Every structure is written in C-alpha cells, then in structure tokens.
Amino acid sequence: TYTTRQIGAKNTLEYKVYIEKDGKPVSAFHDIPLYADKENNIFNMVVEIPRWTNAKLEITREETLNPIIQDTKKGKLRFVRNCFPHHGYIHNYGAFPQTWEDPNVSHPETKAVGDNDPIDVLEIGETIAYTGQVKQVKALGIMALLDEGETDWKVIAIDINDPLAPKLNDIEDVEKYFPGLLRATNEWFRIYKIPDGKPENQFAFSGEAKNKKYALDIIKETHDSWKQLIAGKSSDSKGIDLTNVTLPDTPTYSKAASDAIPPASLKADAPIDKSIDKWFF
Amino acid sequence: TYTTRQIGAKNTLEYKVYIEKDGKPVSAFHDIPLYADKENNIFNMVVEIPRWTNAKLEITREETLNPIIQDTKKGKLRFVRNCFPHHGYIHNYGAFPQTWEDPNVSHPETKAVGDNDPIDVLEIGETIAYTGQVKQVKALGIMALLDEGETDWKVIAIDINDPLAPKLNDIEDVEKYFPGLLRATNEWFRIYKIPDGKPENQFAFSGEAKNKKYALDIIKETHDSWKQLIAGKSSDSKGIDLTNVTLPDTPTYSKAASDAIPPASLKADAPIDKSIDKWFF
Numbered sequence A, B: 001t002y003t004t005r006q007i008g009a010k011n012t013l014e015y016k017v018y019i020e021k022d023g024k025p026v027s028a029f030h031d032i033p034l035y036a037d038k039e040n041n042i043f044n045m046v047v048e049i050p051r052w053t054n055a056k057l058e059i060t061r062e063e064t065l066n067p068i069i070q071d072t073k074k075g076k077l078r079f080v081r082n083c084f085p086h087h088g089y090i091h092n093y094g095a096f097p098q099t100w101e102d103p104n105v106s107h108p109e110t111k112a113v114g115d116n117d118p119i120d121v122l123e124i125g126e127t128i129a130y131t132g133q134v135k136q137v138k139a140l141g142i143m144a145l146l147d148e149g150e151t152d153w154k155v156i157a158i159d160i161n162d163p164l165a166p167k168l169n170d171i172e173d174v175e176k177y178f179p180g181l182l183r184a185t186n187e188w189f190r191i192y193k194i195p196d197g198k199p200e201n202q203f204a205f206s207g208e209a210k211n212k213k214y215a216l217d218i219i220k221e222t223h224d225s226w227k228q229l230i231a232g233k234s235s236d237s238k239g240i241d242l243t244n245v246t247l248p249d250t251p252t253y254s255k256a257a258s259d260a261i262p263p264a265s266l267k268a269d270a271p272i273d274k275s276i277d278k279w280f281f
C-alpha cells in the first residue's frame, strides 16, 4: 500500500512497477485495501497512468503480485494516441484494488459482461500522479462505459488532499468546479480508440454521470465479485493470478511470494517513438 | 543553423540555449537566414517552446547572440498555466529569424505598431519540436492579436517534413486537416493570460486567420525592417543587441562573440513546481 519497485526503464518491454508495503512487494490487485476508511467511504486508488501521458500501463492480471506493466499489441508497446483537443489521458488513471468487472455475467445496466479488470477510476485533482502511487480518494460519481462492448464503469474521484476535496461531495460539484470536464470525459472514452482502427465506444444512460450513491452501489458490486474470485469461487477466473500475501483465508495466499520478486532496477525512461506525438483530428 | 548549446539547467534563471552552426554559436535573431529557399518561400523557423509544455521561453533581443531564455517577471520565472481543454502550449511556438516588428511603424487594417520582436510562428505539425531547433516550414496563414496598441501577428506554419505538408498550402487546408485547431488557437490566445490575472486578449479581423499571401506580405515586411535594423539604420534599436558573427559588413559583426560563449552545461532539468500541473477552468 506504500512504496514502488521499478524494474528497468519506463517505455520499455522490461518495465514493471510493483507496489511495496514496507519495502516488500504486495499484489496491486488483491493486497491493497479497497477502503482506506470504510467509515467515510475513502478508497485506496492505485494510479496506473498519469494525466497527459500515453503509455498504456496496467495492473497485469496474470503476473504474480500483478505489477503494472505496459500493454502490448502484437508484441509492440501500446500507447493511447492524442485525440484533439486532448493530450494523452485527461485524468490520472487507475483502479480500485479488490474489485472485479465480472466477465462471466451480463451486467443489467449495460447488458454486457465485464471487462475482467478492477474497476477503473478517474481522479480529477490538480496534481499529476505517478505510476504505482496509492492515493486516497472519495467517489463523486460513475459513468457506464461500454469499452469494446464490455461493461467498463469509470468512477469519478478526487484525491483527499486536493485543495478542492472539501468542496467536492457529489457529481454536481464536478460540473460546478470543473466545467466541461465530464462532457470531455464522455467524449474522450468514446473516441480514444479510433486512432487504433477501432470503433467508437458507447455509454449507457446517454453518458450521464451517475451520482455518488450510484457509484458506491456499483463499486460494492465489483468488490463482491472480487471476494468470490479471490475465494476461488468464480466460475472462471479467466487466467488471473490470485497469488496474494495479505489474505490468509484465501487458497492462493503466500507471504513469501513477495520475496521472489527481483529487487528494484530503475533505469532512466527510455525515449518514446516520435509518432506518439501526433495529434489526431 | 545546425545544433544547440544549452547553458544552465532547464527551468532555471540561468537557463539559456544557443543555436550553433557547425559547433560555433551564432545569433538566433540575426545569423539564421529567414529563407531556407527564397523562391519557394521555405523559411527557417527558430523553435522556442515545444508543444504541450508550459515554460515561457523566448529569444532575448537584449543578450549577445540572442539566446533563448525563460521569461521572468520581477524575478519569477514565467510559465503559461493549463487552460481547459488545453495543456500548456498547443503549438510548437517559434519565431522567424531576421524579422522584426518595428515599434515605430503602424498597420492601418490593424491599427497598431510593432512589438519590437521577431515575428511569431505557430508550427502546427505532428512532431513536438525542441527549444533552439531550426526547422524548415511553409507559411499557411496569419492571425493578428492586438496586445495594447501593437499588432502581434502569428504566422500559422507547417514543417516541410511533416507527412501532411504536401496536402497543406493555404489556411483553408488547416480547417480541412486540423478541424478545430483554428478556434483553439483563437481561444488559447484569448484566455491564456486570464489565469495570470490578466484580461482576455483581442483579435483583429474578428479572429480571422488571413491566408498565405497575406502572411507572405507581412513576413517580407518584417524582414525589410530587420534589414534596416541590422544595418544600423533603424530609428530606435533600444535594447536590441545586434551582435552577429555571419554578416561581415554590418556595424555589429563580431566573430569573437561566438568565441565568448560558455560550454554546454552538464545539469539535469530543474524540477517544476507542482502548481504548474493545475488545470484551470
């Protein structure tokens, strides 16, 4: 829940970022609490992709302790392209740990199976985050994205330490203080894959940002799917590595899975190919 | 017209970049030829600010060999803030060398004088340029901002090496291949001071980007102004250091000025304050 272990250089096939709790790698999927404060609904967010970057960095579902590694496409690193007027991702992009978009069941809101990942979070605060960061966020609302035909909810969140956090308590506050951001988000996740030769995505509810209560309800849903999956009780865990070092009541618990992770070998960020500069229109 | 030499660490009051021709520093204002190909109107552009950065960099007209440094006001380094939905600068921002906007001369359709600087160039191509880079661009059109009694033209240009450059020749082609970029340009120059406590800027021709010929006329005007300037014939070259190392009959020729320039610095970029992350709405 605590620090970062970087293997290799950023923008490179060798790159991994493990999350450390007390110097030791924990599973970024399973081993980080959903709640930093269940009492006040403060969540733990795992940051994957800083605002205004392109490299498609993910918690890897099939790698032990699920380090963040860059996605690849036929072997080549994957970057999201710049879709005018936007530069890379327009949110600090991450996941709530201990949640799962159930791929095996059709979700009633969207009429589709889940995308088989943690539930995604758009943290809208002013400071750009870093990969591997665990931060504390509160939920403002939620958008029902169908990303390539899979239920792919996007939680709208704000860092608890953001200057604006006190003023932001529900989704109406985001339009109030961040005018046009939600419209832009609706647009961004519709179009961000056209440059890749893929179709426009879709939203349920015409892309309406559902409120905090609705967000809490859906996060709850994805948490319970995760509790089944991590219990070994999913109909299909879809090849996910459920090795964890904090949850002893689960079949795949192993404290020294941590020990077998290589030590940090941070190198300077490799250069990104110049083509990733291009602004698509 | 060749390489760069950086003195200082980037994002620092000490920071300066020089253009080198074959290892040796020349004036970025005076020694880079305006035309890379006159008869075809291919100009050499001096790039000051990469697209999607914040630091307000500029050729100094008052320093010898006129290095690119960061603007300051009352001792504080100057950055442009992030104005939604824009991230920093939305063009590669540069100037044409061997041009100058005579403050002692006035336009009538744009009732306003020179701002005493080289003409500003917005290069609209896909690759993000580097500070001090000299690229070959073609002019497509020109907008006229009206900063207090002085006409601030902005040539709209594209890199000659850009994949799209053959398809682009006049201002309507920007509307064709870069839909929305013109209105963004228009919006950005209008608001980009509002976060700095300033008013909204103000366009001539009701924000109309006039065409290639209109740009060629202006550009060629400001070269003729520079010509009388460098020849020592100018009415008022207050504050302009006209030192140059390639024009051997000018009053201000001095090869030794190249020789005087410190070696390139071995300092990593200074950190930028996280307040610059902020997205302003």
Ligand SMILES: [Mg+2]
Binding pocket: A115, A117, A118, A119, A120, A152
């Ligand atoms: Mg997802």
Ligand SMILES: [Mg+2]
Binding pocket: B115, B117, B118, B119, B120, B152, B153
């Ligand atoms: Mg100017």
